[PDB]
């Protein structure tokens, strides 16, 4: 449908977002995911902290380097959920994984690009209300991710700019609306109306 | 006569041999290869320096557990050596080829070494005595060496085929209209 699809991860459930990203890649669709720190996991914060520490004790006994790597960042916690859904040791898998980018925050050019959502991974649509869940940023920070403040800062700044942008556009669509309605009731208008437009 | 494969032009070339020479095959392989393709004059100067331990010979195939030296950097190499006997035997054969080039009346300033090939002459047995009344083989590993020098020459010209093209009725149609349509 589009050469590139930018997903705003905020309010999405990790495994369900991962599951749909993986498939799109293997079908040849490029994906970049933004705001990974705003991602969600079901279960209360403590369960998922505990689950991370579970993952944290696994290491190669003779050399901790060869052993499993533990990435603390939100985008990387995500990439793990995703990479496990791809057969990543095959040329085909490595090919699909190169179609992917994950980001905490919304860095340049993507900030001025439109982003979309995935209704089948959306927490508020998916989780039954009252169930407890977890924000990826807080989880990561508890396991050693260093950058939560820097990201939140830059975002608050980015969010101010985007607000002006929006305001100017909402104003412009107010003129366009007024003009469109002054053309209403003319011939060409009523004719389009007949044809469903 | 009947050397190993050569692509060169015999009219502009001269050559040389030695056979059954007692020199490490492994060593002179590495040294022969170090000169391969070189401008003959630059090669002779190079070999002299190796003897002076000013530069070395990159040991590429048979190097395992050789030492390391800064003199391999030139060749992008940590392991290099200074195999005197190999060098002297090669520059002997180099010197021979030079003479033959003169005698053929070839220009001595155009000369580069186009073919240099060493391989294994038959071995030479000697024996050594080992603990508990035992004997083992102790053997020479002699080489055959051959090289060829050639006068350098300029480019290739062109001389290629015409690549006959075969296209369908609908294919030759678009072409005829392409010029009909535009330039």
């Amino acid at each position: 449908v589009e050469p590139v699809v930018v997903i705003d991860g905020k309010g999405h459930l990790v495994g369900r977002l991962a599951s749909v990203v993986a498939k799109q890649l293997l079908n040849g669709q490029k994906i970049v995911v933004v705001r990974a720190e705003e991602l969600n996991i079901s279960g209360e914060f403590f369960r998922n902290k505990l689950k991370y520490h579970d993952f944290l004790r696994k290491a190669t006994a003779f050399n901790k380097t060869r052993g499993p790597f533990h990435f603390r960042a939100p985008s990387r916690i995500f990439y793990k959920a995703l990479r496990g859904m791809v057969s990543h040791k095959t040329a085909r898998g490595k090919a699909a994984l190169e179609r992917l980018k994950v980001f905490e925050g919304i860095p340049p050019p993507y900030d001025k690009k439109k982003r979309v959502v995935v209704p089948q991974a959306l927490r508020v649509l998916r989780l039954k209300p009252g169930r407890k869940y977890t924000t990826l940023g807080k989880l990561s920070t508890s396991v050693g991710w260093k950058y939560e403040d820097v990201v939140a800062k830059l975002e608050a700044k980015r969010k101010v700019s985007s607000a002006e942008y929006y305001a100017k556009k909402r104003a412009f669509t107010k003129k366009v609306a007024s003009a469109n309605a002054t053309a209403a009731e003319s011939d060409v208008a009523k004719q389009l109306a007949a044809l469903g437009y | 006569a009947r050397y190993g494969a050569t692509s060169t032009n015999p009219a502009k070339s001269a050559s040389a041999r030695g056979s059954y020479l007692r020199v490490s095959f492994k060593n002179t392989r590495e040294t022969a290869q170090a000169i391969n393709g070189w401008e003959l004059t630059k090669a002779q100067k190079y070999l002299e320096q190796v003897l002076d331990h000013q530069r070395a010979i990159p040991f590429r195939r048979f190097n395992s557990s050789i030492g390391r030296t800064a003199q391999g950097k030139e060749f992008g190499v940590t392991k290099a050596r200074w195999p005197a006997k190999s060098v002297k035997f090669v520059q002997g054969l180099l010197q021979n080829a030079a003479a033959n080039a003169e005698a053929k009346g070839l220009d001595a300033t155009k000369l580069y070494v186009s073919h240099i090939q060493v391989n294994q002459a038959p071995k030479q047995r000697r024996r050594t005595y080992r603990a508990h009344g035992r004997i083992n083989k102790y053997e020479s590993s002699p080489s055959h060496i051959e090289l060829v020098v050639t006068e350098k020459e300029e480019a290739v010209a062109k001389a290629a085929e015409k690549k006959v093209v075969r296209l369908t009725s609908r294919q030759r149609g678009r072409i005829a209209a392409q010029k009909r349509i535009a330039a």
Binding site: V1, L26, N27, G28, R92, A95, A96 | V165, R166, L167, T168, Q171
Partner: protein, 106 residues
């Protein structure tokens, strides 16, 4: 105009396969905008091209094509099965493919 396109876009997904064994004789095609087997019944028999490039000019072009046709529908989501004159190369899983509107029954 800007759009010259006479075909529907599609994706080479897989070979026909089990869990552990595939069948290079059949390719599974995802057609854009077809979400159900019923929708996909329209395309059966339509002809498919996979178009690609090469270094050697042959008949005068550097562009080559593998031709095939849609054969049956596949599963509930509007995927389609198709066979080609020669089997598709399998480096093309994920590659784009062209489904035409002929032969037309409209």
């Amino acid at each position: 105009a800007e759009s010259h396109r006479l075909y529907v876009k599609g994706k080479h997904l897989s070979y026909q396969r089990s869990k552990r064994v595939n069948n290079p004789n059949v390719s599974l095609i995802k057609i854009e905008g077809v979400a159900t087997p019923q929708d996909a019944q329209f395309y059966l028999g339509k002809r498919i091209a996979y178009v690609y490039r090469a270094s050697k000019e042959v008949r005068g072009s550097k562009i080559r094509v593998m031709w095939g046709k849609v054969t049956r529908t596949h599963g509930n989501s509007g995927v389609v099965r198709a066979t080609f004159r020669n089997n598709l190369p399998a480096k093309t899983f994920g590659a784009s493919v062209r489904i035409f509107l002929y032969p037309s029954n409209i």
